Design a binder for this molecule. Structure first.
Ligand SMILES: [Zn+2]
Ligand SMILES: [Zn+2]
Ligand SMILES: [Zn+2]
Lengths: 385, 453, 652
């Protein structure tokens, strides 16, 4: 019965085209198993200066293995990567690390952009018991009251790491729809390997996007989907003003070494508990402390540092696309317009405008690293006007 | 104890030789082919920039400017990069050009180097006989097999072939080398101790060393010539020549060439002539350093998981011979997976001494594309096993000496301490029992000193 | 006599196994393992079929081909070493009579289809179908119905031989009762089942059933219908884990009649699945404990995960005599007696309540412990119809003459270390054969004296103690359980004198030994304990996290390796994927201990675990080392000079 039936599963899958060329097409189906969802982007409108809120379910669902030795191990490790790749892409923003554990919510790291503080917090978050049940109501309470004091010229989005369990919290979180719909705060959850309808209704009543974790690769995809600053609901803001352009200071300008250290509890700046020698300078406090392209606590305006953060999204929107042809128009001497090679896996990648020939390793290098076709350069800037 | 300099010696090859001979004899080592030989068998990055000025520096720059080229960071590394470059005798310390010593290079090398930098259609560049591809009569991967099998008939006939070696007088030098030897009846081409070490080595630079020692056995030809010719081999391959090695001939240049097809690295046709052939072998001599190109054959991955030697790939018999010295006694079939012994392969280094890196080298040379997707730490603990195994049998450090006991005084013993420490002929002392371990070679100078007082 | 199924085949046809010349059937493989790997995949790789000995596993680019067959190809293999993503060797044995949902030619096809026509030597061929699949159902009419098979072409030899040896032959309250008898269908196809020859002839028959070329599979139809009584089973909230959930699923993938023998690793759910088989099966069962040591244990988790206890408890060794009158579910011990009135009425009860046991179940822990002389009394005394072999050992006692499927039938399941130690509750041991540089004033004497006081010399070593003193405080800092196993008492006694710890010996009072277990296994203040030869064997299963050993002299590799395999449990709830169970051994250099450890670490890498030899400490004088002066060691030395041979012998 089943001793045969356990091996009726194996026997055919083992078997293939016999005689010659055996265990060959089994490898071909594995390549045919590949090539999942690429981009499907092309959007406009919103996404600028997010104010994210990490919300972590700490529950007994973590004790199931399912991808890793812990579901936090699946979670927490790639959050650091998600932190770094965020600060890579979006430095104009800041993130609220808030942890739910034992039916409450602990705002673990404040809404800020200092990566080491966030990452070591995750390195502190390693040895978490995740005792108790999730409570989103305490999480939204922090999320309200913090972002309540943020301007309406702020992007208001929440990223919830939920372990798909029972949403164990009172006090009419169904009525928190109209609370937060009016409060123009977006809330995005993704479910860990299952679905919560109420939370699925929550996000579809939000405009925040809900998903379910499939796999570790798939876990990365939706992170990567939420790296990009999304086009949230209309009528948020237009502008955001008193973007402080700073100065770097060399502390060697006119008076050479007239100050042994530029942090002595009286100097304009010197914000954090450490010694400094003068590296930076804000306009409004005239605040000189450790360099930070974010904001301050006395002038209270945004320490904008343009080549970093006014450059990051500044080309992250205006992209175009390529096309693929299997044909052989042999442009070059059977070459690439970029790296100049050939393999011909029938993916001759042609630009939409300048129409230049590329490979996967030239398409990926654009569509992950270069983000534009340089074949448009020499082609845009020469007749540009 | 045991010799350990006969394995590597890869900067002293151009130093201990060169500094062991005269400046005018190494003035001969500034043939224009010998220019690339200088820069590469030394590997400092720090002296490798101190050269770079001198093509634009005819002038002797002052010593302090480059003595203070690099500040507080790595002053020793600057100093370690300095006197060795000076120990090449390529520099001249000027006296007082402007008021103080300002160093400068030998210009005749600067003459020779700049032709190998820009311009020059000279004798090595062109105009006399250098090189010549006329029409393809013979191909390189076919000759790569020659460049494999001559190594075999070298390395197998070291161990001993059921086949035979070609008619060489080289064995009478390799028996002379102390790699091989032969007792007088019939002259058996065995191994003494050192070919066994070279069996554990895999680079042609030892061959090169005995080929540098080839003229040393009372032969009087161009040592200047052959080391130029040692470079003149190091030209990759792809050249037959309209007998261009005879148009650029010399006496030893043709005769010792008969030996380079004995050494296999040249390939000579009918009458040992009409062409010449450098083999793809002509780039790993150039370093002696491991090299990703130095892969010979690409068998596969290995591992030594559960320290049980763990690999397959039915290879040629030379690798089988490379482990016939290294793994018998539970050999198996068609995959070459002789099991492990922590005693026998340990006993299989007793005729070599420690093969510490030579394990690690043949770790990355057993099956060659192993570093493609494997761990950086290829032996997890297994190096230390091999180490402790090597650190087991080495129970002795052989050292002769003369010892001075029952000395008549105690403070004059400290004089003879300070006397021998002046001489540097002491190895060890015991002051508590009035003892000094003194070299017996430097015994006589204290033996003379004690008899004088 | 009459105990001969097909023994393991390869004995000849091979000369200097370096078949650089012949490899003739491997040349058939080496054609297509080498002609096939050209374009970035191998489509080859015959598992390196070797005629004699065994063959291998590729398992380095398994992808789907051999990674599916990382398990499935291993049916008749056993995968005796384990590795990293590389090759993996095995052995070969009786394990086709277990693999009886498949034909020996069907595997032979896929044995070829894996090997890319890497052709057999034939050695396996002449050993493929030596025993055709054949079962022995025990159907409702009180003994057996003479089941043959799904397939017919076997009675054609059989019925032309066997009968000429020995013949064979209210409404709604009862409506569903025949609906159950409606479910008594064709036994998957045709059954071909005959009638019991009077219940006393099968013993006379079984010896001739195998006599041609067939082999028989005794079953246990004890679940749907059963004419005698059923005890009260009750599984009181005994949540268990998928290592052993798969196990009974292998015992029951078919209907309600098939016996079973399953291998676990050490310390696994041993007293669970049999207790699970005690209750789910609805039988009246039997345990055969190894000693009374086992007997107290196996009832205790039975007292835990079964509420079947209302003097419903039958433990039967060393004057236990607990519930003779009325047997429901029993624990016994292997009556190895054969003596002249050994236990007069007591073993008579063991005889006569075996008869009341009828068949029950043969719960058999670790039958590598059982000799073949006792394997006589396995079948001779106990004549049951379903067995249970709880034996971690696959191959034992170097006896390739008598195999074990003739004893217990098929050997059903073995559980992977990898899917317990990396994915599962079983902790990761760091094995440590630690050798030390001794003081030479133990060794000049040693080589002077060719008399067993020399054994005690390296034994009583402060260089051993400096290691012993070390890891105590080094693992006091992690606040986790540690246990040290010495060789003999009076050396170990001074360890319990110098750095005095919990400890035992041979004649120690058990009620205070139990207090020591209470002081150890409950009290968190002292995580340190000493044991002797007896405590591993005759009193306790210790439950700890870190083990140190001193004794390594006798060649019982596994017997020592199953001590550590039982004791070492999970250290903490560690988030990391590291090794958390810990083994330590103390090795004398230049010694029998140096020599034995070489074979011992050979046996360690024979099964293959996380192993490291360290020699130096993590800073020796970091700790205030006692015996730092060798004069103090000379004080110990003169005790050793005053010592006799009596401190230098174990329990045997
Ligand atoms: Zn300000
Ligand atoms: Zn391209
Ligand atoms: Zn373009």
């Amino acid at each position: 019965r089943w001793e045969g039936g356990y091996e009726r599963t194996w026997e055919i899958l083992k078997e293939d085209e016999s005689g010659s060329l055996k265990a060959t097409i089994e490898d071909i189906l594995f390549k045919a198993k590949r090539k999942r969802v690429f981009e499907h982007h092309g959007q406009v409108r919103l996404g600028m200066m997010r104010h994210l809120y990490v919300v972590v379910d700490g529950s007994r669902t973590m004790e199931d293995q399912d991808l890793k030795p812990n579901r936090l191990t699946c979670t927490l490790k790639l959050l650091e990567y998600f932190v770094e790749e965020y600060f890579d892409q979006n430095p104009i923003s800041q993130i609220g690390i808030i942890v739910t554990k034992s039916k409450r919510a602990e705002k673990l790291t404040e809404l800020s952009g200092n990566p080491r503080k966030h990452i070591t917090s995750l390195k502190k978050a390693v040895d978490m018991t995740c005792h108790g049940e999730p409570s989103l109501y305490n999480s939204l309470s922090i999320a309200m009251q913090t972002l309540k004091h943020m301007p309406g010229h702020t992007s208001r989005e929440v990223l919830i790491i939920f372990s798909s369990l029972t949403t164990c919290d009172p006090s009419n979180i169904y009525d928190l729809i109209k609370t937060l719909k009016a409060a123009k705060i977006r809330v995005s959850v993704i479910g860990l390997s299952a679905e919560v309808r109420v939370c699925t209704v929550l996000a579809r009543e939000t405009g925040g996007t809900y998903h379910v974790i499939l796999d570790e690769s798939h876990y990365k995809e939706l992170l990567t989907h939420h790296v990009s600053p999304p086009p949230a609901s209309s009528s948020s803001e237009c502008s955001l003003i008193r973007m402080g352009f700073p100065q770097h200071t060399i502390a060697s300008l006119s008076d050479q070494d007239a100050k042994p250290s530029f942090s002595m509890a009286h100097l304009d700046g010197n914000t954090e508990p450490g010694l400094t020698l003068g590296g930076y300078f804000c306009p409004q406090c005239r605040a000189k402390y450790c360099e930070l392209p974010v904001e301050c606590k006395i002038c209270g305006l945004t320490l904008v540092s343009a080549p970093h953060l006014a450059r990051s999204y500044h080309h992250l929107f205006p992209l175009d696309a390529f096309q693929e042809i299997p044909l052989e128009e042999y442009n070059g001497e059977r070459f690439c317009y970029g790296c100049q090679g050939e393999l011909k896996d029938q993916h001759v990648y042609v630009c939409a405008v300048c129409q230049n020939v590329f490979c996967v390793d030239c398409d990926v290098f654009v569509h992950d690293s270069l983000h534009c076709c340089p074949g448009c350069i020499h082609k845009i800037p020469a007749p540009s006007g | 104890s045991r010799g350990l300099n006969r394995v590597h010696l890869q900067c002293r090859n151009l130093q201990e030789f060169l500094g062991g001979l005269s400046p005018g004899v190494l003035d001969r080592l500034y043939g224009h082919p010998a220019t690339c030989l200088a820069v590469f068998r030394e590997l400092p990055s720090l002296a490798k920039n101190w050269v770079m000025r001198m093509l634009f520096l005819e002038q002797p720059l002052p010593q302090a400017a480059v003595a203070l080229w690099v500040k507080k960071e790595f002053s020793k590394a600057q100093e370690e990069s300095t006197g060795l470059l000076s120990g090449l005798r390529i520099w001249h310390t000027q006296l007082l050009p402007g008021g103080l010593q300002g160093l400068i290079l030998n210009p005749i090398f600067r003459q020779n180097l700049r032709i190998a930098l820009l311009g020059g259609g000279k004798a090595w560049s062109d105009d006399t006989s250098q090189l010549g591809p006329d029409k393809h009569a013979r191909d390189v991967p076919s000759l790569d097999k020659y460049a494999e099998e001559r190594w075999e008939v070298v390395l197998h006939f070291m161990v001993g072939s059921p086949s035979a070696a070609v008619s060489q007088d080289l064995a009478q030098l390799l028996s002379q080398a102390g790699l091989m030897k032969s007792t007088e009846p019939g002259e058996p081409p065995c191994i003494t101790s050192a070919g066994f070490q070279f069996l554990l080595l895999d680079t042609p630079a030892q061959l090169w060393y005995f080929m540098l020692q080839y003229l040393q056995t009372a032969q009087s030809r161009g040592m200047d010539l052959v080391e130029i010719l040692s470079f003149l081999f190091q030209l990759s391959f792809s050249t037959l020549g309209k007998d261009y090695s005879v148009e650029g001939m010399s006496d030893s240049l043709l005769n010792f060439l008969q030996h380079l097809r004995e050494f296999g690295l040249v390939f000579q046709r009918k009458r040992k002539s009409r062409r010449y052939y450098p083999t793809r072998l002509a780039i790993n001599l150039s370093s002696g350093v491991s090299g990703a190109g130095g892969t010979v054959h690409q068998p596969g991955f290995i591992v030594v998981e559960t320290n049980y030697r763990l690999y397959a790939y039915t290879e040629s018999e030379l690798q089988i011979a490379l482990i016939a010295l290294f793994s018998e006694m539970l050999y198996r079939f068609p995959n070459m997976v002789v099991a492990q012994v922590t005693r026998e392969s340990v006993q299989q280094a007793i005729a070599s001494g420690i093969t510490a890196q030579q394990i690690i080298h043949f770790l990355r040379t057993r099956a060659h594309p192993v570093m493609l997707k494997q761990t950086p730490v290829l032996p997890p603990t297994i190096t230390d096993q091999i180490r402790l195994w090597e650190l087991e049998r080495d129970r002795l450090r052989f050292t002769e000496g003369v010892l001075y006991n029952q000395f008549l005084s105690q403070v004059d013993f400290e004089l003879l301490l300070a006397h021998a420490r002046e001489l540097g002929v002491l190895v060890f002392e015991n002051s508590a029992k009035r003892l000094m371990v003194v070299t017996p070679a430097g015994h006589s100078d204290v033996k003379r000193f004690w008899k004088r007082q | 006599p009459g105990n001969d199924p097909q023994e393991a085949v390869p004995s000849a046809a091979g000369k200097q196994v370096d078949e650089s010349g012949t490899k003739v059937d491997e040349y058939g493989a080496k054609d297509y393992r080498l002609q096939m790997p050209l374009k970035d995949d191998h489509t080859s790789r015959p598992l390196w079929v070797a005629p004699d000995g065994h063959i291998f596993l590729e398992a380095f680019s398994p992808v789907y081909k051999y990674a599916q067959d990382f398990l499935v190809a291993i049916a008749e293999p056993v995968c005796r070493p384990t590795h990293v993503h590389e090759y993996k060797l095995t052995a070969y044995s009786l394990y086709a009579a277990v693999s009886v949902g498949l034909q020996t030619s069907d595997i032979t096809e896929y044995l070829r289809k894996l090997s890319k026509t890497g052709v057999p030597d034939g050695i396996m061929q002449f050993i493929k179908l030596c025993t055709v699949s054949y079962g022995k159902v025990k159907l409702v009419l009180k003994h057996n119905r003479y089941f043959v098979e799904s397939c017919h072409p076997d009675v054609i030899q059989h019925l032309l031989q066997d009968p000429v040896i020995r013949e064979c032959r209210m409404d709604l309250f009862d409506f569903y009762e025949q609906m159950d008898k409606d479910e008594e269908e064709e036994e998957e196809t045709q059954t071909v089942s005959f009638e019991v020859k009077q219940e006393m002839i099968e013993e006379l028959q079984k010896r001739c059933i195998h006599l041609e070329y067939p082999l028989l599979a005794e079953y246990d139809f004890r679940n749907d219908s059963v004419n005698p009584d059923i005890n009260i089973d009750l599984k009181p909230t005994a949540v268990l884990r998928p290592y052993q959930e798969k196990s009974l699923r292998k015992m029951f993938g078919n209907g309600r009649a098939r016996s079973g023998v399953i291998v676990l690793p050490c310390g696994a759910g041993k007293s669970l699945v049999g207790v699970t088989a005690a209750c789910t099966v609805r039988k009246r069962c039997l345990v055969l404990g190894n000693s009374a040591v086992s007997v107290e244990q196996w009832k205790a988790q039975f007292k835990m995960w079964s509420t079947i206890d209302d003097s419903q408890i039958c433990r039967f060794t060393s004057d236990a005599k607990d519930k003779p009158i009325g047997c429901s579910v029993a624990i016994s011990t292997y009556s190895m007696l054969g003596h002249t009135t050994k236990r007069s009425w007591e073993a008579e009860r063991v005889m006569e309540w075996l008869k009341t046991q009828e068949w029950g179940l043969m719960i058999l822990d670790e039958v590598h412990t059982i000799p073949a002389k006792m394997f006589r009394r396995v079948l001779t005394i106990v004549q049951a119809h379903c067995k249970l072999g709880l034996t971690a050992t696959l191959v034992r006692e170097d006896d390739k003459i008598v195999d074990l499927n003739f004893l217990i039938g098929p050997k059903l399941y073995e559980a992977n270390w990898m899917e317990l130690q990396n994915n599962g509750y079983i902790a990761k041991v760091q094995c440590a054969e630690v050798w030390c540089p001794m003081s030479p004033e133990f060794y000049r004497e040693y080589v002077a004296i060719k008399t067993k006081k020399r054994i005690l010399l390296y034994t009583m070593n402060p260089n051993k103690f400096r290691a012993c003193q070390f890891l105590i405080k080094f693992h006091e800092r992690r606040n986790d359980k540690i246990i040290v196993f010495a060789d003999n008492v009076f050396a170990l006694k001074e360890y319990a004198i110098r750095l005095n710890k919990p400890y035992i010996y041979g004649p120690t009072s058990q009620g205070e030994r139990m207090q020591i277990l209470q002081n150890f296994k409950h009290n968190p203040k002292i995580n340190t304990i000493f044991i002797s030869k007896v405590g591993d064997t005759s009193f306790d299963l210790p439950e700890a996290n870190v083990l140190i050993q001193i004794s390594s002299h006798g060649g019982s590799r596994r017997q020592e390796a199953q001590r550590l395999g039982r004791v070492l449990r999970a250290k903490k709830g560690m988030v990391a994927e590291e090794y958390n169970a810990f083994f330590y051994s103390l090795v004398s250099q230049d010694t029998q201990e140096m020599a034995y450890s070489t074979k011992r670490q050979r046996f360690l890498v024979d099964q293959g675990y996380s192993f490291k030899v360290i020699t130096k400490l993590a800073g020796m004088e970091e700790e205030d080392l006692a015996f730092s002066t060798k004069e103090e060691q000379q004080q110990l030395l003169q005790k050793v000079l005053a010592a006799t041979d009596l401190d230098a012998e174990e329990e045997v």
